[PDB]
Design a protein around this ligand. Structure first.
Ligand SMILES: Cc1cc2nc3c(=O)[nH]c(=O)nc-3n(C[C@H](O)[C@H](O)[C@H](O)COP(=O)(O)O)c2cc1C
Ligand SMILES: C=C(C)[C@@H]1CC=C(C)C(=O)C1
Ligand SMILES: [Cl-]
Ligand SMILES: [Mg+2]
Ligand SMILES: [Mg+2]
Ligand code: NA
Ligand code: NA
Length: 398
């Protein structure tokens, strides 16, 4: 069905439909597919889904010149811990990614691989089964009681990374980025948001370290910036973006309750701008809005009103992708895109609307999404959401 009560607005007369260059890519509009974990990768080996993933991405690439950021992809076994999320470390994985990238490119769209490292969000029992550590910044603060208990039961208690282990992750980020580019991706996005490992370092709740990787703003940002620098060196700043969620509370991050949170993220933005002014500007910064502090909650819930991401624009002078509850709020998008370096990520409604871009341009009804199949091992709720035309034929206008 279409979303009931939604009053669409045609956005074709806004900058959402003005072209913009991101990295090497000439986007034809500024509606971005943000990274969306869908859990269709197959076990063993975290293999992108051999049956459906090409079709899923092909569908969502259908509007020419669309920027697509992939679902988070694990950079190594140790970075993982969900059996049905894909990786980008193995030949068998890259065989499938190559097909996906080729398909997106045939539709004249673009694809950026999100590089994911889970830290304390991983399942410790999966990791123990595979002989892997359960990692985070610290060893004395835990995501939640259930995770702590799972880790203990698995004889895999949460481990605070050594500097050498941080370096090993950086090596893996580098190789994952290389793999991505070699397989044909247009770039990579470093996931430093939503309470995964890099965010666990950024945030003073989760990072209680007293070495150079914690205990101050500069130190908490060090790992994220080392990954940035390593990837810029390896594949070029024009092929690297960074995702941050300053106000996020998902995965037990602090959000606005931490009075130092804006300073922490301002520091990161500043360091990116410093690199940019010195000749190495990242392709983009991707921000999750305080509009959605937890993407597991229905649109409108978990909105933080005590903060704005606008501060980033005073600091970072490059492209900014913003995501969070924009599909149902064209009136907000209309205002935000008046800024000429702002792009809009649409997550949940890109799950349910493969032709979302057409619908945004033309002010069409949106397909209701089905949360229950966000993470399912099925084509259903993955590749069988209809285009607007197909929905009319199904009688959804009624
Ligand atoms: C099912 C689902 C999977 C997601 N997977 C990822 C992910 O892999 N990486 C990431 O950075 N964000 C992920 N997100 C967060 C989204 O990219 C996006 O920021 C969020 O859904 C808010 O935007 P929306 O209101 O347009 O959905 C996910 C969100 C959902 C609902
Ligand atoms: C629905 C979410 C909370 C997403 C699930 C997986 C990843 C990698 C996120 O960044 C958040
Ligand atoms: Cl799992
Ligand atoms: Mg210990
Ligand atoms: Mg159902
Ligand atoms: Na449906
Ligand atoms: Na099938």
């Amino acid at each position: 069905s279409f979303v009931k009560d939604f009053k669409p607005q045609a956005l074709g007369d806004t900058n959402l439909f003005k072209p913009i260059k991101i990295g090497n890519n000439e986007l034809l509009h500024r509606a971005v597919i943000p990274p969306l974990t869908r859990m269709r990768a197959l076990h063993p080996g975290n293999i992108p889904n051999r049956d459906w993933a090409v079709e899923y991405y092909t569908q969502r690439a259908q509007r020419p010149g669309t920027m697509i950021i992939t679902e988070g992809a694990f950079i190594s076994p140790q970075a993982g811990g969900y059996d049905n999320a894909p990786g980008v470390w193995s030949e068998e994985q890259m065989v499938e990614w190559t097909k996906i990238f080729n398909a997106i490119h045939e539709k004249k769209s673009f694809v950026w691989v999100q590089l994911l490292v889970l830290g304390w969000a991983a399942f410790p029992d999966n990791l123990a089964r595979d002989g892997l550590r359960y990692d985070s910044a610290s060893d004395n603060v835990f995501m939640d009681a259930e995770q702590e208990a799972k880790a203990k039961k698995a004889n895999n208690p949460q481990h605070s990374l050594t500097k050498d282990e941080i370096k090993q992750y950086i090596k893996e980020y580098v190789q994952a980025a290389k793999n991505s580019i070699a397989a044909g991706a247009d770039g990579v996005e470093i996931h430093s948001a939503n309470g995964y490992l890099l965010n666990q370092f950024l945030d003073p709740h989760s990072n209680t370290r007293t070495d150079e990787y914690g205990g101050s703003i500069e130190n908490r940002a060090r790992f994220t910036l080392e990954v940035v620098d390593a990837l810029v060196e390896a594949i070029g700043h024009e092929k690297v973006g960074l995702r941050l969620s300053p106000y996020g509370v998902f995965n037990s991050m602090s959000g606005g309750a931490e009075t130092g949170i804006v300073a922490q993220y301002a520091y990161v933005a500043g360091e990116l701008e410093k690199r940019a002014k010195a000749g190495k500007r990242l392709a983009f910064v991707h921000l999750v809005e305080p509009r959605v502090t937890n993407p597991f909650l229905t649109e409108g819930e978990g909105e933080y009103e005590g903060g704005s991401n606008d501060f980033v624009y005073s600091i970072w002078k490059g492209p900014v992708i913003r995501a969070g509850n924009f599909a149902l709020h064209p009136e907000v998008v209309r205002e935000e895109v008046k800024d000429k370096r702002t792009l809009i990520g649409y997550g949940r409604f890109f799950i349910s609307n493969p032709d979302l871009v057409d619908r945004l341009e033309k002010g069409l009804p949106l397909n209701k999404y089905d949360r229950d199949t966000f993470y399912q091992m099925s084509a259903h709720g993955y590749i069988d959401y209809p285009t607007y035309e197909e929905a009319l034929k199904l009688g959804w206008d009624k």
